[PDB]
């Protein structure tokens, strides 16, 4: 478990520094303009809270999953938009001035909608209630290591736009070093993950959920005829999820032996999400080159 605590601390520092780097690409005026007249934000919220949990429900019903496995899929589905989308949307020149709005409003709306969707969906899968085990002190606390670095980044750019360099290179160097450290800390647990006989249905579900998220986001954006960058921004916000709540919910609700192999599910979700995001990024950059 000390490895888990070290991973959490290194990941918190990772988020802090990467968002300090990322906060240089937006301005407060554009944030205000995009927050007003909520067109893109409404579509992103409707997507993330009506088509990703419904996809979780239908996919769990159709793949013939257990009660606990279906519960894990549902909890990952209902989770708020992750902070991975902020980093990813830069890789295809998405409207970064709107991805922050999406992430913040998604977290705030999750704080009060996750129990509602969980109660509406887990009927027949869970005997008790899930409106009591959702960590409300973590949803609103995960938002701080995102807003604080971004806010100091925009303040640095707007007030003193001469320290643009130097800090960027130092942040990239420390990010690379801590990423190598996390790789070392994770390769020792991937072995136990593969030793555990995770059912191939769950691997298929974790690989196929983000793909459906991305494609349904793109289709939804195309239906309402959004812009160019905003289309990719919504189509990749609606697919990235914060699966660090699934582990907490499962640990609180069920004994450590009932979840079993599902304790490694968030790592699998992250690795498949990274793989699919990077594949899409490479495809889009190749498209832009031609």
């Amino acid at each position: 478990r000390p490895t888990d605590l070290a991973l959490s601390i290194i990941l918190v520092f990772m988020l802090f520094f990467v968002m300090l780097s990322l906060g240089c690409t937006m301005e407060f005026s554009k944030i205000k303009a995009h927050l007003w007249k909520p067109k893109g934000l409404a579509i992103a919220l409707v997507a993330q809270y009506g088509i990703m949990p419904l996809t979780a429900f239908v996919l769990g019903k159709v793949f013939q999953l257990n009660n606990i496995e279906a519960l894990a899929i549902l909890v990952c589905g209902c989770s708020p938009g992750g902070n991975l989308s902020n980093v990813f949307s830069l890789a295809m020149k998405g409207d970064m001035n709107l991805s922050i709005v999406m992430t913040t409003c998604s977290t705030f709306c999750a704080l009060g909608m996750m129990p509602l969707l969980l109660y509406l969906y887990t009927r027949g899968i869970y005997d008790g209630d899930l409106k009591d085990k959702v960590p409300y002190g973590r949803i609103i606390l995960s938002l701080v290591p995102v807003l604080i670095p971004c806010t100091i980044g925009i303040v640095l750019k707007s007030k003193r736009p001469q320290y643009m360099r130097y800090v960027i290179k130092g942040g990239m160097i420390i990010i690379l070093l801590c990423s190598v450290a996390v790789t070392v800390l994770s390769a020792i647990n991937v072995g136990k993950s593969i030793m555990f006989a995770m059912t191939p249905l769950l691997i298929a579900t974790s690989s196929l959920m983000p793909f459906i998220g991305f494609l349904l986001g793109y289709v939804l954006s195309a239906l309402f005829c959004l812009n160019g960058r905003c289309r990719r921004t919504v189509s990749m916000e609606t697919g990235c999820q914060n699966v660090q709540l699934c582990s907490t919910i499962l640990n609180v609700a069920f004994p450590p032996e009932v979840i079993g192999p599902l304790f490694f599910f968030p790592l699998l979700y992250m690795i498949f999400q990274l793989g699919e995001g990077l594949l899409l990024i490479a495809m889009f950059r190749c498209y832009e080159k031609f």
């Epitope: 478990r1 490895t3 013939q64 257990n66 009660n67 606990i68 005997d127 008790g128 009591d132 085990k133 647990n189 136990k192 030793m195 555990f196 006989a197 059912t199 609180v252 609700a253 004994p255 450590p256 032996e257 009932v258 079993g260 192999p261 304790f263 490694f264």
Partner: antibody, heavy 122, light 107 residues
Framework: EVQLQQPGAELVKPGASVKLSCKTS????????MKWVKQRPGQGLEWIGE????????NYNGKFKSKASLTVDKSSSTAYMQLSSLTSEDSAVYYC???????????????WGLGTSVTVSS | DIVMTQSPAIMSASPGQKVTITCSAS?????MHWYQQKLGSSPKLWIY???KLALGVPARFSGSGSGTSYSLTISSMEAEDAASYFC?????????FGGGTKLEIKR
């Protein structure tokens, strides 16, 4: 050493209520779930319910939801049960179990109580 | 709920011959765990996740199978193994134990 202490036997009257205690010592009481198992002589084991001492959340069996009420008291480390409105077919042996389980280094180990032989006298 | 049809209910065996106990679930179960209860004692975990061994169980025991048919195999039976074995699953609530087989010793 881990030890779970249970009363040897309890005597009741039909239609009455009884409280079963499972005093645990030698380990921190608020980490492992406490599972209650009922064994009727002549049948297999039946699972009754769980309870997380540090949180209070419980999961019951389908047919024991209206007969069992698991409760804990972390100050005394004592996990309780309250069978209600006993019948002639409730005469059995009730065990309290904790299961150690982890995935970092895979291993498991059970710690069972001695069983509280509950019978209906009349 | 998943019911278990564990057969045979009563088994006769010899100290040195291989014996097998089959637990036949009535629905798809991922993992099946076996409990051993001796004479006048609380059952203790014996084999969990259908192939692994608990702490203290001798290495002779072994479980196999997947789907809705799990088996427990003893390579070389000894006189200390005469007890009752229950198959137990916790992957789909409520947890349901099997009917149990009474393993004896022949002479």
């Amino acid at each position: 050493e881990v030890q779970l202490q249970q009363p040897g036997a309890e005597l009741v009257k039909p239609g009455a209520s009884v409280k079963l205690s499972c005093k645990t010592s030698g380990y921190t009481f608020t980490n492992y779930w406490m599972k209650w198992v009922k064994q009727r002589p002549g049948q297999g084991l039946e699972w009754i319910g769980e309870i997380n001492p540090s949180n209070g959340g419980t999961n019951y069996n389908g047919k024991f939801k209206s007969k069992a009420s698991l409760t804990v008291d972390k100050s005394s480390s004592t996990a309780y049960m309250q069978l209600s409105s006993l019948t002639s077919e409730d005469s059995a042996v009730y065990y309290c179990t904790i299961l150690v389980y982890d995935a970092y280094y895979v291993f498991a180990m059970d710690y069972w109580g001695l069983g509280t032989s509950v019978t209906v006298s009349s | 709920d998943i019911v278990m049809t564990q057969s045979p209910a009563i088994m006769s065996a010899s100290p040195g011959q291989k014996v097998t106990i089959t637990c036949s679930a009535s629905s798809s179960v991922n993992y099946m765990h076996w409990y051993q209860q001796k004479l006048g004692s609380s059952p203790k975990l014996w084999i969990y996740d259908t192939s692994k061994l608990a702490l203290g169980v001798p290495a002779r025991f072994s479980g196999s199978g997947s789907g809705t048919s799990y088996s427990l195999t003893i390579s070389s039976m000894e006189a200390e193994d005469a007890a009752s074995y229950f198959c137990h699953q916790w992957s789909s609530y409520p947890r349901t134990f099997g009917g149990g087989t009474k393993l004896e010793i022949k002479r």
